[PDB]
Each structure stands twice: as C-alpha cells, then as structure tokens.
Amino acid sequence: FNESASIPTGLTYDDVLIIPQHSRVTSRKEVNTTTRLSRNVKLSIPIVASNMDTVCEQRMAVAMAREGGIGILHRFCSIEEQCAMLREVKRAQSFLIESPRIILPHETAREAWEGLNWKGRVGGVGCLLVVNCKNERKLLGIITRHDLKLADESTTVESLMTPVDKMVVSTNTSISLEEVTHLMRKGRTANVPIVGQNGQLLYLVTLSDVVKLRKNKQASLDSRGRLLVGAAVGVKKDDMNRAIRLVEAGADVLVVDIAHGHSDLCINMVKRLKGDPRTASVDIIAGNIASAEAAEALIDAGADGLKIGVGPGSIAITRLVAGAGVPQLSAVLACTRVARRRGVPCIADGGLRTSGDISKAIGAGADTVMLGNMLAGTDEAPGRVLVKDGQKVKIIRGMAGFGANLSKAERERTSLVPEGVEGSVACKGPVGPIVRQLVGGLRSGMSYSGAKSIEEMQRRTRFVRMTGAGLRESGSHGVA
Amino acid sequence: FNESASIPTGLTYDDVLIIPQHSRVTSRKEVNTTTRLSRNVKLSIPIVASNMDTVCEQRMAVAMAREGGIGILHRFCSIEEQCAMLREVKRAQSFLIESPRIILPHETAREAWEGLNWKGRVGGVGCLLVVNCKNERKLLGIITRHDLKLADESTTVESLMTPVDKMVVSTNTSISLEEVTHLMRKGRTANVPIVGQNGQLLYLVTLSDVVKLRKNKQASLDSRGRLLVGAAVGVKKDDMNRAIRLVEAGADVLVVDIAHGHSDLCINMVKRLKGDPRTASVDIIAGNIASAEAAEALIDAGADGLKIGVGPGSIAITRLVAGAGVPQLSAVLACTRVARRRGVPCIADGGLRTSGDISKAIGAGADTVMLGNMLAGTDEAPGRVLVKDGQKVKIIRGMAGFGANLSKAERERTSLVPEGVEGSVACKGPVGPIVRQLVGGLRSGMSYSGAKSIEEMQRRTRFVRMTGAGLRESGSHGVA
Amino acid sequence: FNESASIPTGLTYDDVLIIPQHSRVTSRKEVNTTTRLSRNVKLSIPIVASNMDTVCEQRMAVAMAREGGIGILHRFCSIEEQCAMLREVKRAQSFLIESPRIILPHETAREAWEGLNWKGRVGGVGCLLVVNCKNERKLLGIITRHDLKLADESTTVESLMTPVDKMVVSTNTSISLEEVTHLMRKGRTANVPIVGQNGQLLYLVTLSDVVKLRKNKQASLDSRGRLLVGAAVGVKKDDMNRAIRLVEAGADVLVVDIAHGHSDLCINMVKRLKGDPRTASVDIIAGNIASAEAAEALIDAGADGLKIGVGPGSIAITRLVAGAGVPQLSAVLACTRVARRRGVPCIADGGLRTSGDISKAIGAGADTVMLGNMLAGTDEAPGRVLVKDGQKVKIIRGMAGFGANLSKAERERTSLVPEGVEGSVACKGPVGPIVRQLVGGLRSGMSYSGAKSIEEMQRRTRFVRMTGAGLRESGSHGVA
Ligand SMILES: Nc1nc2c(ncn2[C@@H]2O[C@H](COP(=O)(O)O)[C@@H](O)[C@H]2O)c(=O)[nH]1
Ligand SMILES: Nc1nc2c(ncn2[C@@H]2O[C@H](COP(=O)(O)O)[C@@H](O)[C@H]2O)c(=O)[nH]1
Ligand SMILES: Nc1nc2c(ncn2[C@@H]2O[C@H](COP(=O)(O)O)[C@@H](O)[C@H]2O)c(=O)[nH]1
Ligand SMILES: Nc1nc2c(ncn2[C@@H]2O[C@H](COP(=O)(O)O)[C@@H](O)[C@H]2O)c(=O)[nH]1
Ligand SMILES: Nc1nc2c(ncn2[C@@H]2O[C@H](COP(=O)(O)O)[C@@H](O)[C@H]2O)c(=O)[nH]1
Ligand SMILES: Nc1nc2c(ncn2[C@@H]2O[C@H](COP(=O)(O)O)[C@@H](O)[C@H]2O)c(=O)[nH]1
Ligand SMILES: [K+]
Ligand SMILES: [K+]
Ligand SMILES: [K+]
C-alpha cells in the first residue's frame, strides 16, 4: 500500500508542545507583545476578535482596541448597518471630537436628556454644546448630565447651561495634548470646545479623552486618537460598494473573507481593492488559506495580510461537509514561511482553545491570532443571555450555518449546504479580563522560549510532537 | 522487533483531509458530477444505494435513479421477488408504455378503481384504456381517476369513458418527444395511445412522462426512457438462473457481490456471466475487493466495474469475526490505481458517514460511492418505522448477520457465524433532499480541489494525514 | 396543626383511573363523539388545538376542522396577521367560492402560474377564470394547471384556455349539491362557474369541493361549507378592534383568553363582546378559570363557553411564579358542575398527555379538550424543524414566556415576569393520524364507561383514586 505512505502528516496545536529554552527573562514586564496585523498596522497585543455575528459588533470592537488588539466587524448585516457599527466604534473616544453633539437654548431638559442618550455612541455622550442654530453653531454655552440632575422636564436648556463667557474655549485647531491639559488644569474645567474665528463650534476636547491619552498608551488608535477597527467584506460585485462605504466610515483595514481564499474570486477581489483609490487607502487582508501556494498567490495579488485557517474553527464543519482542510499548526508553519520572506503578516484563525495554543500559533510564525469561541459569551459579544438547562449561556454559530445565514437574510431584506453549526457557550463576563489572562499566558510561553518579543518568539520557538498519551499527561489528570 | 516495522499502514477517511488547491471555480453551477458506474453505464451523480434489504428495494431504486444515481436491488429474496421489484422500477415511468393497463367496457367503476390501483406500479396508474377484449385490444376509449370521482360503484366503464373517436390517437410507433408534445398541445389532451393498423392498442404516451422528459434530464434512464436499476447476484449455481431472469426483467447492470471478491468463486461467476449471451448483454460489476492484485484478477475475468470494501460497513463486523480487511481510503487508492489503467470504474462501498467522506472517496480515485447507513431510515428505504425508546427509527442490519439471513430463509422458503449486526437508525425523511445535500457537499469538496469534473477531482486531489488531535479539531469542538 | 387539616385536596389526571362499567357496546363504531364547543357550536370530535404560536396557525386550524375538531388562532400577531390567517382557513374549501381568482386573456402563462400560486390559500388554487376585465368579470373561459403543463412562459392565456362556450356554466346562485353534482357528471367537467344575468362571474363550484361534501361529513363546517375556526382575543381596549375585525374575517367563535379569567377585566370583555352587534353574532368563550365561583361569574357575564385550567399546561409555570392554580381534574369537576346546570360547555385546557387523559377530562364533565404539547411538532404546527442534539425537533413555548412575547413585539411592531418556558418537542409527523389515534383512545375509554355518547360518558363515568404506587403499575413496568 505505497500510495498511502507518501501522504504527508499535518499537525494541529494539540499535537505539539513548545520545548523550553534558555530564558534570560528576569521580569514578566520585560516581555513585549507588540506585533503587526498587516503591513502597515501595528497592535500592542496579538489578539483579533473574529468577524462572527456572535463575537464582534461595536461593543466587542471597542473593548478589543482598548486592550491593544482589534476587532473585525462582521458583514452579515446591511452595508448601512455595518457602517453604523463602525461609526459607533469611532465615536467611543477621540482627541478632537468632530461634529460634537449640540442643542439649542430654548429646548427643554427633557430634550437635553434625549440628546445626551444619543444612539451614535454606546453609553451616549456626557455633554451637549449649546449653540444658536444648527446652521451656524455659534457657541452659547454647555450643558452636562450634572446640570440636569435637579431640573424639571420643562426647564429650559439656557436656564441650566454654563454660558460661553464662563467657559474655557480655544481657537487652536492644532492644539496639542499638553496644551489642552494645561487649559483644563488652569481653567479647572472638563470640556474645551474649539471654535472658529466667528465663534462657531468646530471641535470638542473632553477631560475623559485627555485622561485616556495620558494613561497607558496600550490602546489601538488611529491618527485622530480614535479606536482602531477593521471590517470584513466578501468577493461579490456588491462587496466593492460595501468596501468603499466602510472605508468612508473609518475602517482602518479591510478583510476579504471567504472559506476558500485560494480562489480567483478572492484574488480578484484583492486586486480590485488595491486598484481603486477609494479602498486602496487601507491595508487589505485576505483569507482564508492554508498552503504555501495560496500564500504566494494572495501576496502576489497585493494582500497586506493573510488569514490562515481552513476548517479548524470551533463551529466549523467544512472538514465534515466538503472533506477539505489542513491541520492548523502545519497550515501556519507553511503559510508563514512564504509570508515572512515577503514581509506579509499572518493571522492564525480558528481552533484556538487556550492561551497555550496562542503561544504555539505565534511560535509557529503567526503575527496575530483570531478568536471566536474564546470571546463568545462575553459581555461585549452580541446576543442575548439565555438559560440553557440551568446556567446562563450565549449563542455561538458558524457563519456558513443556517442560523447566521437566515439572520443575514433578515438584516439585508432578502439552497444552503451548511458548513457551520450553532451552539451555546457559558457566559464569560467582561472580555477585558479574559484578554488580559490570554496575553499573560502568551507571555509565559514566550518566557519558556526565552523570547522578549514576538519576532524572537517566532525565531526561537522549537516544538516537540506528542502522542495521545502525551496529550493526556499535559492537562489535569488523576484528580477531581 | 523488526517484523512489526515492515507492516504497511492503511488509512481510512477519518485519517485524511483534502488539501485546498487553487480554484478557478466561480459558480457552484460549473461543477459537473457526471461519472461512470461501469464501463458502459454513466450516472449524473456518483451515488449508489446499497444492495441491503434495509436500504434498496423498488421505492429506493426509483428515487435514486430520479436523482441521477442508481440503486442496486438486493438478492435476499426469491428470484421471483427480485424480478418483481425490478419490473416495478421499470414501470415507474417510460416514454412508450408497453402493455398499458386496460379494462373492458361492460365492467363497473368498482373494477375500474381496482385496475387503477394496480400493484405493478407503486402508486398505481392514472388511466385505463378501454378495449373490446383482452385478445384484440381494439381501442374503444379511455377512463381516468377523474372520470370516476362522482360515479357509483355499479356504473359501467363505457358510461363514464371518453370514447376513442373523441381521443387523440397515433399510429406512429416511432413518434418523437417533440411530435407527441405537439399532439398533446394541439389536442389539449394528456394521453396519446399508439394503435396499430387495425385499431389495436400498442403503446400509451402520457403527459406525465412527457413533462418529465422535457424537464431536467438529470434522471438515470435506459434507452426506453425508464429508470435505470441494477441487481445483485451471488456466485452459486442457482445465481446464474437469477441473473438470467433479472436481465430479462430489465436489469441494466448486474452486481456479483460476495464478502471476499478475490476468490475463484467470484472470478468464475464473472467469467460465466460474460460467457453467456443471456447475461452478457449488461455490464457485470464484481466485488468486494480491497487490493491491487484483486482488482487485476477481477478485471482479467472481464468485470466492467469493481466494488471496493472489505469490512468498513456501518453494520459490518468481518474485521471482528475473521480479522480481515483494509482501511478504506488505502483500499480505494490501491484498487483504482490498477483499474484506472484498464478503464474499469470503481465503487467505493462502505464506511462513508458524511458528504466530506464522499469527496475523499472520489479524490482517492473512486468513480461512485455506495451508501447503506446514510440512506437507511429514509422514507424510501424498506421496513416499518419503529419507536426505539422515544423517537421514530428504522432497522438497519448487516447482510451477513442473523436478521437478514433468517429473512432470506422466510422469503425463499427454506450454521451461521455472523459477520454483520442489526441496529436502528433515526427516521430521516425522504431520500431526495438527503441525496441533494450529499451531492452539494461533494461539489464543495471538488471546489476545494479546484475541480470542475469527477476526472479532475480524481487527478487534482491531494491529501494530508491528520492525527487523532487533528480529527478532533475537524468536527465541532468547544460548544453545545 | 388544625389549620392544615381543613385544606381540601385537589386531584389531577394522574391521580385517578376510570372505573370499568357494564358496557353494552358491541362495535367500536357505535361510540359517537359529537360534542359542543360552545352554546351554539357543535363538533364531531372533542379536540381543540391550542391558541399557542407554536401550535395553531392556518395549517393547524385547517387540519383540525378537517378531522372534525377546531383550532383557535393565536393572537400573538398583528390584527392584520390574525385576520389573514383566518381568511386563509376560510379559503381552504367552500361550496360556493366567493370572489374566485381570475386572469385576463392577454396575460402570459408565466402570469397564469403566478396567479395559480396565490398566497391567499395554502397550496394556491387549481384554476383561474378568464374574464374580460377586473371591473366586469365577464366570463371568457377557464385555465388550469393542466393547460399550462406544455406552455412556454410567453404563451397567452387565451391561447391555452377553454373558452366559455365550451364550459358548463350555471345561473343558479342557489344551486344544490345534488344539482351541481349532476351538472358535473353530465357535463364531464370539474368546474362550474355561476354567472349573473349579464354573463358576469359570481361564484365557482369545483369538483374537489363537491367530492369533499359528498364524502364523510365529519369536517367542521360553517353554513357556507367552509372550515370552522376560532380566534383568541385579549381584554385590552384594542382587543375590541381585533375582535370586530376577526368576526368580519369569518371567525366562528371568539375566545377571550387571559391567565386569570376570574377577573373584572375578563368579565367586562365578555360583557363588551356580547353588547356590541359587531361581535355578538358569534359565540364568546372565556377563560381561564378553575373554580365554581369563576364559572358562575363568567356565565353570568354572558359566556357561551368556558375554558378551564390555571397552571397545568406543559410549558406553564404560573404555579411556580405566582404559586396559584388548581389540580386540573378537580378544576374540571367543580367548573362543569356549575356550567352543566346553565347549559354552558367547558373546554378542559392544559395538562393532557395521553388519550387516556382525554377520557378522564370528558368523564369529569368537559365537553372538549384543548391540546398544546400533544399537537406541537406536528407537520401542521408552526415553526421550523430543528436538530436538537441528533433528532428532528420543533419549538414549543409558553405564551407568558420570553420567547413568545418578544415575537409578539416583532410582529406587532413594538418588565416581563415570565410564567411560561421554552422547549423542544420531537417532530411528530402529520397531525391527522395523531388526532385519529387520540379519538380512538377516547372511544376506548367511553367503552369502559359503557358510554355510547359524550353526554353518557359525562353521566356514567366513575373514578377511583390511585397512589403513586398505583400510578407506577398503570404505565409500562419491568420491561425494556
Ligand atoms: N461630549 C461629547 N462626547 C462625545 C461626543 N462624541 C463622542 N464622545 C465621547 O464620549 C466620551 C465623553 O465622556 P463623558 O465624560 O462625556 O461621559 C469621550 O470619550 C468622547 O470622545 C460628543 O459629541 N460629545
Ligand atoms: N469552515 C467554517 N469556518 C467558520 C465558520 N464560521 C466561522 N468560521 C471560522 O472559525 C473562526 C473561529 O474559530 P474559533 O476561534 O471559534 O475556533 C472564524 O474566525 C472563521 O475563520 C463556518 O461556518 N465554517
Ligand atoms: N396510464 C398508465 N400509466 C402507466 C402505466 N404503466 C406505467 N405507468 C406510469 O404511470 C405514470 C402515469 O401517471 P398518471 O398521470 O397516469 O398518474 C407515468 O409515469 C406512466 O409511465 C399504465 O399501464 N398506464
Ligand atoms: N462485512 C460485511 N459487510 C456488509 C454487511 N452488510 C453490508 N455490508 C457492506 O456494507 C456496505 C454499507 O456500508 P455503510 O454505508 O452502511 O457503512 C454495503 O454496501 C456492503 O458492502 C455484512 O453483514 N458484513
Ligand atoms: N379554483 C379555485 N379554487 C379555490 C379558490 N379559492 C379557494 N379555492 C379552493 O381550492 C380548492 C381547489 O382545488 P383544485 O382542484 O382547484 O386544486 C377547493 O377546495 C376550492 O374551494 C379559487 O379562487 N379558485
Ligand atoms: N400559565 C400559563 N399557561 C400557558 C402558557 N402558555 C400556554 N398556556 C396554557 O397551556 C395550554 C397548553 O397545555 P398543554 O396541552 O401543552 O399541556 C394552553 O392552551 C394554555 O391554556 C403560559 O405561558 N403560562
Ligand atoms: K499536567
Ligand atoms: K472544526
Ligand atoms: K400497566
């Protein structure tokens, strides 16, 4: 039976351990996890939230960027819906707030409360600038939640506002962080509007944003100090329109995402996106792939990053429906060998269950990991909490399954051989502490490889293969 | 321990994945699944229903041919019974209906209803031609279910019939599909009898059959426009008599089927079948085999197709009773290497659980797959629905087990070391949608291999081996 | 502890058995199950499908009426939606079809096919009458599915139609069933339009409807030969508008349905419905109640029928959330004692698990039973089939639970302490055979009471109480 002997063996994460190496690491603090998402996008931590409609919408994208990673907004929504989520992410924080929310002086406190609970930002906004009219936005004063706390619904805005002559106001549209910090410290105020030469409202700077920018600059930020966020598109004719509008909404990267990324459909979508100035202003990531030849083709088509993984996802059953796939450790090894020589970062997407798997993925050459299941069921993941026979749970479902595709039909106003499933995950709490523990686990693995950086982790890691017997010894055994 | 190291390793479907390849496939519609069952028999889809007495009798054979595959009628029945199932399959549809059912004009509506519910076709027939007597069949008119809907049981046929002078009748025994379509369109009628020069009834053409022939020519048809169907025989002296009578009944292929096909018993049965003009008019398929040497021997004996599989069947325990077998992927690889050079198609028989396994079998060189378990418990599978501790189930049982062999004794009017078992499967509904989903899964696997045809799938597919750890990552993991 | 001793004991179905009595019943056919739903509505069988959004929409209501029972359309939909379901039920069959579907002669076969698949009747319609224009409906001919079977999408209706001068047409707007049967038998036709003095189309009579009316008159029919159907309303101001529109749509009874029917809200809704001529034309049923005092109050308010049951429903948890309820056998006994003296039929609603429970409910005085769980998951029940960890299932959910109430918000375009739950039931197949088996079980229980009628069952039944030990002996014990 000679044909069988020539078939190569592919490995997944559970097939290997990282071999301990000489470590000069003395402090857990010396281990730097900064990495590249794509050719022109750096991240403080190598964690990407999956573009799944049970993992990443605006609340997850905001949380991931705040931890120093990023979320990819899923495309199983209308273009209008996807862009709206993106604008909400961009609205979470800023340095100079463009188009700050305003109100007119003859309006009521009831209308002030409605403006403060603006649906354009999760949590609303903390102040409204009082202006004479919508067209001129001549600044008359400012009103905050605090100023409304004892008001009757009928009380006028101007009766409760701080007038502009009592405000600290600037005309410096280039004001620095140090300068506005000085104005707030000296003026003992929490809001500095920026106005034009005719007193018209141009920007707002808030103490909340200044405090964040002065603190740990872990957060993933664009050039305006807003949170970084990506968005997924498909490969159909209409996806080009989606891509253009996502970039207009502020997308920092686009992710071309189809099950079989080694296809002309994906290669031609990448070429189209790099060929149009309306979309070529942002890095184009493409997947999903699992071979050296596929990496070469997508890189040659112009991809700024590659997403690796055919079948390993928790809710994925491509391997059961089509029979196709590559064990994920071998896929990462093969794809990153090609990509590293061309300078193209790779996302290891799918099949990760523990922080230990993240260490292995980075050790096998990945620059980032993409997580679905490990982040599903967190507070910030979309969906309702449900009681699944006793405990609190949330839905996780494949994007090639029935549930996600009927929901894509219900949201976009519209013969499926499914390649994903639906299930529940236990509610995990806020995603922040979970991400921090995963990064802490990665740092432990880097210390075992003697690595103080991601590039050192990729260069220094050596693996040893284990049998099923070795795998059992690796988890907890013999206790209850 | 050197002897052990020289034993080769055989692989089954769960040992490998199809490696994704460059795909130029743009539309799911561009993927053609047409294939060969045997040297002279083509099929639109590569699915064969197993010759098991819990899988394929007349209703399953009809359904499979209608989907573009085929069923193999099992031989655990009397010759008379096997031939009767075959004639019912052939009676399901036709272009020219030979010996159409008739009735005499002085008969009653009660007798008309009995003739319409003729046991020679599942569902009966829709019309009876009224003729003067059984010997001359001079056409007097036609009576349909519609004409009986308000009749009393005592009303005469001729009182309710449409008379012949009001019918559209032809004398063209070579009438084309376009010509009879024109006669039906112009005559605004649903039945065109074909009569001889003396008005005697020769054939009938019905609108139902014309509509089918005008629609999607997916269905597996013989030269008369009837559904294709095969039949199994053994290797005993009496099996030659069974074979002759099956061919007379309309069998389109014969399948010589014994557990150990690499035996003189099987080789000599193939030689006997090719040597007799009463059976050599149809392709002779033989199995079951699992080695290159076995393929060579059966091909040299004259086989037009090979059936591959020793032990992998869901209900099979040959490997537990005799200890013999070959892991099915390696068996397909080895057998098809020999057979492809001789032009002999191969059926991968047994051990298939998902559409993904079908993609692997075709990728390993098989031209068709044979399914037992995946089709058992469908509406069209034989047997009664049963309640197995709550839910609706149907029996599936091995043909070398006790249950099937006592039933073979009860049907043919008649020291077993069993090599099959009995069990239940959940009721699956109609087989049609299940077959369509399996073919859809296969098309997905072909797209991953970049293949637009079965021959391209066989040439282009490359496998990667996975460990048990890789297999776990391949299904659903970490969700409920 | 004397206070405790004075609390009476309530019984449920599992607490009692029907004591066998002297039976003169010789044939299973002698047992008549005809009963009253309400003062002025009779049913051939005593089975009512529950007004739950997982049990009864138009397909279930049609099936129940065809078996001789009735369905109550649920109100967790817009008024427009509830009325639309009702009109579809009324459209399922008729004697004189009002406003039969028409088409114009210059239209295409493609437009004919669209008219035949009219969404106003489940399954569409079988013919379209060809008329000169929508305003006059002068009959020009008729076109059927059969006439389109060989047409091109572009072929004109008038080219394919049967012209009116070749049709059998009547001007008798009072035509009897015997007379139209004669016209169809003599004319050898399946459609008899009824036209006016100027040839304008007034009604259509079809052979399908005639055959049904000639067969077993088991079906629950209104005076026009359409299927009987009821509809639920609440007790809010807007429910009066819903009630008026339901009656206009053809509702044969209205069911005032709230959890606590012994309340001024329910009593005043009944009084309002009986007091308005727009709703007083149909029987008003009210519930849910569980005491003699409650029956007296609703009867005094004018109820034509009572629905009995507080808490016993399969998906109901009123008893766990509020702590209130009455064991269902005792509730039926107490309520029917009052109602029988006033001539008001009672529906035993909830907690029924087997046909044996139905016999007990009727024996305890109920005129009908209402079933949710036993009919959920049938083909005709609403909702999608789902795979719940292996087998095919359908959702069943309480109308006071979260799932049904969010769906009521999604359908009507809109602080819940839930009193119902959600769950799955195994798919049961078509509801018809299930209903027939339940009625067969009831007939067996009636035979044990020596009863040949429902009234005899209510008068003759005697119960014996069993302990938990007796209950175990009653089901299957000691076998696998
Ligand atoms: N006041 C105000 N804050 C905004 C607006 N848009 C976004 N934000 C964000 O909302 C946060 C304000 O926090 P606060 O202290 O106002 O609750 C900051 O991160 C700020 O950038 C806006 O229009 N007005
Ligand atoms: N084959 C397949 N992969 C999916 C499907 N849905 C999500 N995925 C993949 O699974 C990844 C998540 O993997 P997880 O971290 O949950 O194991 C996603 O980022 C995506 O690449 C699906 O329906 N089919
Ligand atoms: N009328 C008629 N149909 C037959 C006979 N034998 C087989 N059939 C098949 O029964 C089907 C007729 O459908 P119908 O429209 O008659 O229900 C066709 O597929 C036809 O070929 C026969 O003897 N008479
Ligand atoms: N060894 C053995 N094979 C069987 C027996 N019965 C059926 N088979 C094989 O099992 C195949 C069905 O495999 P399945 O698709 O159910 O896994 C049949 O086509 C036949 O080759 C049996 O009793 N013993
Ligand atoms: N032809 C026709 N049938 C209707 C219409 N509305 C309801 N139906 C019902 O549809 C059924 C007709 O069955 P057919 O034989 O037309 O398939 C009958 O029960 C009939 O009452 C209509 O407008 N036209
Ligand atoms: N208390 C309560 N009863 C319900 C609820 N939903 C349905 N029901 C009752 O339960 C009955 C169905 O009972 P089943 O036949 O499923 O045991 C319905 O007809 C209705 O009276 C609910 O959410 N709460
Ligand atoms: K361990
Ligand atoms: K998987
Ligand atoms: K018993």
Author numbering:
A (entry chain A), B (entry chain A), C (entry chain A): 3 to 416, 424 to 489
Give sentences copied directly from the paper behind this entry.
Here, we demonstrate the determination of the crystal structures of T. brucei GMPR; a protein that, unlike the GMPRs of host animals, possesses a CBS domain. We further show that TbGMPR activity is regulated by purine nucleotide binding to an allosteric regulatory site formed at the cleft between the catalytic and CBS domains of the enzyme. Our kinetic and structural analyses clearly demonstrate that the CBS domain has a pivotal role in the allosteric regulation of the activity and structure of TbGMPR, facilitating the transitions among three conformations: a tetramer, and octamers with relaxed and twisted conformations. A combination of X-ray crystallography and size-exclusion chromatography small-angle X-ray scattering (SEC-SAXS) analysis clearly revealed that TbGMPR can exist as a tetramer or an octamer depending on the nucleotide species that is bound to the CBS domain.
We also determined the structure of TbGMPR C318A with substrate GMP (C318A/GMP) at 1.90-Å resolution and found that C318A/GMP adopted an octameric structure as observed in C318A apo. However, two tetramers in the C318A/GMP octamer were arranged in a twisted position around the fourfold axis compared to C318A apo, and the overall structure of the C318A/GMP octamer was compressed along the fourfold axis. Thus, it appears that GMP induces the transformation of TbGMPR from a “relaxed” (C318A apo) to a “twisted” form (C318A/GMP). Two GMP molecules were observed in each subunit of C318A/GMP; one was found in the active site, whereas the other was bound to the cleft between the catalytic and CBS domains. The interactions between the active site and the substrate GMP molecule involved 12 hydrogen bonds and 7 C–C contacts. The interactions between the base moiety of GMP and three amino acid residues (Met401, Ala402, and Glu428) in the catalytic domain appeared to stabilize the α-helix and a portion of the following loop structure that were disordered in C318A apo. The ligand GMP molecule at the allosteric regulatory site formed 10 hydrogen bonds to and exhibited 13 hydrophobic interactions with the amino acid residues in the CBS domain; at the same time, the O6 and N7 atoms in the GMP molecule interacted with Arg93 in the catalytic domain via hydrogen bonds. The structures of the isolated catalytic and CBS domains in C318A/GMP could be well-superposed with the respective domains in C318A apo. However, the relative orientation of these domains was obviously different between C318A/GMP and C318A apo: the CBS domain is rotated ~40° between these two structures, a change that may be induced by an interaction between the base moiety of GMP and Arg93. This hinge motion is inferred to contribute to the transformation from the relaxed to the twisted octamer.
